[PDB]
């Protein structure tokens, strides 16, 4: 179960400077390349140390490619001012995600290519890769234009053709970084919330990759409906962190067990309060 | 390698 994606964003600027184009590439959700219009010498730059391999032509060709995209984006924004009839003073966001998930048989399992305008679904290539879906009346013009110019065929040829090829190349090229994971470490804390009740908290720290599960149980029973839980966050070192918490009566805190599941954990971790 | 786009909107 693998993927590659390219998330590109373009933002209008009223005044002199032109739209902003930023393109970032992720492999298995982990940033590997990036390119910013607002840089001084704007080029595609690697972001993982394993992309240091690729020869100066790689950079040059993707750079010039992306300047291609910058303009493609510039124009596409202005077109959309006309379709919706918007005034001159404004800022506007065009964004695009596009990619290819792979089966383990090194085989295209689904392709993605879609756009959005003011963070709303504009248009998107259906699963077939021969048919689009278009949201509001304006998208129905762009489908028109792209059904006339046989756009489907050419994306398709990248998604199946070129994208999949390069996902392999990257994977093999960057192998000693795709192994890496960090097991979480974890402790429990005791914060006397009310007169009568306390708050225990299961802290998970220093773990990569991102996904994780925290479960407070009371005598073999989960309390998911009662607990408080905070969406995982990044520490900054590249690790992550996340905790969960439950309300218990004073004195009876030794019933309550918390558990932590993680890829990096060989065996799952189970926790208890101690004074 | 990055998506190249074809026809403007």
């Amino acid at each position, epitope marked *: 179960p693998h993927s590659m994606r390219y998330f590109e964003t373009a933002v209008s600027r009223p005044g002199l400077e032109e739209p902003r184009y930023i393109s970032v590439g992720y492999v298995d959700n982990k940033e590997f390349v990036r390119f910013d219009s607002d840089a001084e010498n704007p080029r595609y730059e690697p972001r993982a140390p394993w992309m240091e391999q690729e020869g100066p032509e790689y950079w040059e060709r993707e750079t010039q*490619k992306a300047k291609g995209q910058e*303009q*493609w984006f510039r124009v596409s924004l202005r077109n959309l001012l006309g379709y919706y009839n918007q005034s001159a003073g404004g800022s506007h966001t065009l964004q695009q995600m596009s990619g290819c998930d792979l089966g383990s048989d090194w085989r295209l399992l689904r392709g993605y290519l879609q756009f959005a305008y003011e963070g709303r679904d504009y248009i998107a290539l259906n699963e077939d890769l021969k048919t689009w879906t278009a949201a509001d009346m304006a998208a129905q013009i762009t489908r028109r234009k792209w059904e006339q110019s046989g756009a489907a*065929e050419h994306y398709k*040829a990248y998604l199946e*053709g*070129e994208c999949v090829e390069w996902l392999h190349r990257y994977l093999k090229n960057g192998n000693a970084t795709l192994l890496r994971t960090d097991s979480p470490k974890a402790h429990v804390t005791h914060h006397p919330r009310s007169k009568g009740e306390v708050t225990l908290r299961c802290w998970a720290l220093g773990f990569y990759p991102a996904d994780i599960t925290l479960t407070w149980q009371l005598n073999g029973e989960e309390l998911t409906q009662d607990m408080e839980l905070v969406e995982t966050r990044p520490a900054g070192d590249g690790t992550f962190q996340k905790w969960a918490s439950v309300v218990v009566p004073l004195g009876k805190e030794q019933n309550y067990t918390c558990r932590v599941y993680h890829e990096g954990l060989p065996e799952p971790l189970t926790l208890r309060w101690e004074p | 390698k990055a998506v*190249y*786009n*074809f026809a403007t909107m």
Partner: T-cell receptor
Framework: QQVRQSPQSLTVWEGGTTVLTCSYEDSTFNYFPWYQQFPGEGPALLISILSVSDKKEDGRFTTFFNKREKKLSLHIIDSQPGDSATYFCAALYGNEKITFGAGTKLTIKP | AVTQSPRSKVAVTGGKVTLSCHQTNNHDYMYWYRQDTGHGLRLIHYSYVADSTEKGDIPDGYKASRPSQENFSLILELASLSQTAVYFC????????????FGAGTRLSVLE
């Protein structure tokens, strides 16, 4: 040069088949259109083909593609005198600037 | 619809020649190509927006101008015997693999 076109100049009889050839040196190139230039007029797109297809066929024009030897070609079947033009084989990668050949000058003698 | 003018021009060497083009295709890319002997299409200059331009493969001796979105122009500061040729304007939509649309052409004799 980057896109090579041969012959330079060609005369063939009405009714004949005609074969224009083309060879390219950027293995990475993807998409190949063919322009048609009738004298008195600027070029105009005739037929085009991706590197995933092996042939594209537009009704008495048909273009053939070959990766191994990095070569491709255009076949006119009936070859009548309303086909007397210069033909350009074109080549590009990604969204790069279309690269145009030298041209072959086709005279369909009636 | 692309349209060039003048359709034909004769010039003395060291002279100033300006050829203009004009497109109602509403495109942003515009290209000055040079055909020698009816043979080849070689890029001189192009322009992806007004009012800036970029050097092609044959930039030497040619200057370029994109006043409006619709108007793109080639300038031969001092005409030379090399520069005698047929000249082609073309527009195209931005993005990859779009079809260029050409002007009918401009022939230039530069004479001693």
């Amino acid at each position: 040069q980057q896109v090579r076109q041969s012959p330079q100049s060609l005369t063939v009889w009405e009714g004949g088949t005609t074969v224009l050839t083309c060879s390219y040196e950027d293995s990475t190139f993807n998409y190949f259109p063919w322009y048609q230039q009738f004298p008195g007029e600027g070029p105009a797109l005739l037929i085009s083909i991706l590197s995933v297809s092996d042939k594209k066929e537009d009704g008495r024009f048909t273009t053939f593609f070959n990766k191994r030897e990095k070569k491709l070609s255009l076949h006119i079947i009936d070859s009548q005198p309303g086909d007397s033009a210069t033909y350009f084989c074109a080549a590009l990668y990604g969204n790069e600037k279309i690269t145009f050949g030298a041209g072959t000058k086709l005279t369909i003698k009636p | 619809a692309v349209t060039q003018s003048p359709r034909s021009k004769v010039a003395v060497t060291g002279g100033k020649v300006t050829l203009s083009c004009h497109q109602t295709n509403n495109h942003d890319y515009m290209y000055w190509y040079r055909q020698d002997t009816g043979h080849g299409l070689r890029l001189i200059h192009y322009s992806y927006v007004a009012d800036s331009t970029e050097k092609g493969d044959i930039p030497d001796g040619y200057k370029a101008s994109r006043p409006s979105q619709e108007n793109f122009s080639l300038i031969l500061e001092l005409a030379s015997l090399s520069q005698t040729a047929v000249y082609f304007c073309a527009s195209s939509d931005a993005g990859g693999r779009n079809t260029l649309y050409f002007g009918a052409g401009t022939r230039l004799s530069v004479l001693e």
